Amino acid sequence: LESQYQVGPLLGSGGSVYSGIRVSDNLPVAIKHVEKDRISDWGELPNGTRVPMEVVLLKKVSSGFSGVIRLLDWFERPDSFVLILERPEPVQDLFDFITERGALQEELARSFFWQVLEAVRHCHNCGVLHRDIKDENILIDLNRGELKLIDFGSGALLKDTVYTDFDGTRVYSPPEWIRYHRYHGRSAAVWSLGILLYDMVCGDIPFEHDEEIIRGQVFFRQRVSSECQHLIRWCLALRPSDRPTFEEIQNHPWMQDVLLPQETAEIHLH
Ligand SMILES: O=C(O)c1ccc2c(c1)nc(Nc1cccc(Cl)c1)c1ccncc12
Ligand SMILES: [Cl-]
């Protein structure tokens, strides 16, 4: 009936997301609506029910692991789908967080960035490729210091062969996409993570136009340490095969002695 939930106010659109409470528990949730007409990419659930790929991917990552948003439930309507998603409270998305705090201290960027890496690796381990990693698609559970990856609407099943379709954010896409319309999932993901790390520590993204992406020359507009500059420049190698693996990123020197999430909440967030 979908009145297991009380809909509250619109939180935004880009489908459309509203705030809600589960009626049992009063558990907080996000209610996301997606029009069938606007959905390009579809899958089949284990029972072979036709659903948006978004839902397939959410169930595949679904888990006790808190670094990826939990899909609590979903409904099909004549012309739409509705997803019941987890809502942290208090919460704030990383784009707003950075917009208001500016460039982040490296300690805090390290914790954040690490948590994002752990979430992305969990996605890849569950056979899922996000394809739209960026500040707007990351939520901060302000009390626990835990980040949550959201919005699998542009995702795909992870594969080892080449992708020739892309539907995520252009300014996070890698040079191979812009000029050949071809990428591999992991290396493109590593590129976007480089953009994101640069955004964390410089307070904005490094490239606006396609010409810039393709030239891939990185200028630091803020004071960033050499270790962090190195890691970023590596993730943003032009040649996909010169990018680090996730293991090399997490073994990188800038990335050592990460804070635990709760420490992170205590020092930077409360
Ligand atoms: O898409 C998901 O997987 C997805 C999943 C969870 C949330 C979400 C998107 N979007 C939120 N906010 C939001 C705010 C403005 C515009 C839009 Cl489109 C969404 C939000 C807020 C609080 N708790 C969970 C969520
Ligand atoms: Cl530091």
Residue numbers in the entry: 34 to 47, 50 to 305
Question: Which sentences from the paper describe this structure?
Answer:
The structure of the complex was solved to 2.4 Å resolution and the electron density clearly defined the inhibitor even before the molecule was introduced into the refinement. CX-4945 is positioned in a pocket formed by a hinge region, glycine-rich loop and the activation loop in an orientation almost identical to that observed in its complex with CK2α kinase (PDB ID: 3PE110). In PIM1-CX-4945 complex structure the inhibitor binds the protein through two direct hydrogen bonds, while the binding of CK2α involves three direct hydrogen bonds. The first direct hydrogen bond is comparable in both structures - the carboxylate group of CX-4945 interacts with the amino group of Lys67 at the active site of PIM1 and equivalent Lys68 in the structure of a complex with CK2α. In PIM1-CX-4945 complex the inhibitor’s carboxylate group forms a hydrogen bond with the main chain amide of Asp186 within the A-loop. The third hydrogen bond stabilizing CX-4945 at the ATP binding site of CK2α is not comparable to the interactions observed in PIM1 structure and involves interaction of a nitrogen within the tricyclic scaffold with the main chain amide group of Val116 residue at the hinge region. Because PIM1 contains Pro123 at an equivalent position, such interaction is not supported. In PIM1 a single water molecule mediates an interaction of carboxylate substituent of the inhibitor and Phe187 and Glu89, while other water molecules connect the phenylamino amine group of the inhibitor with Asp128 and Asp131 of PIM1. The only more significant difference is observed within the hinge region where the sidechain of Val126 within PIM1 provides a hydrophobic contact with the tricyclic scaffold of the inhibitor. In complex containing CX-4945 the loop is partially unstructured, though some weak electron density suggests a conformation comparable to the CX-6258 containing structure is possible.
PIM1 kinase (Provirus Integration site for Moloney leukemia virus) is a member of constitutively active calcium/calmodulin-regulated serine/threonine kinase family. PIM1 adopts a typical bi-lobed kinase fold. The active site is situated between the lobes and enclosed by the hinge region (residues 123–125), the G-loop (residues 44–52) and the activation loop (A-loop; residues 185–204). The A-loop of PIM1 adopts a conformation typical for the active state, a feature independent of phosphorylation as characteristic for constitutively active enzymes.
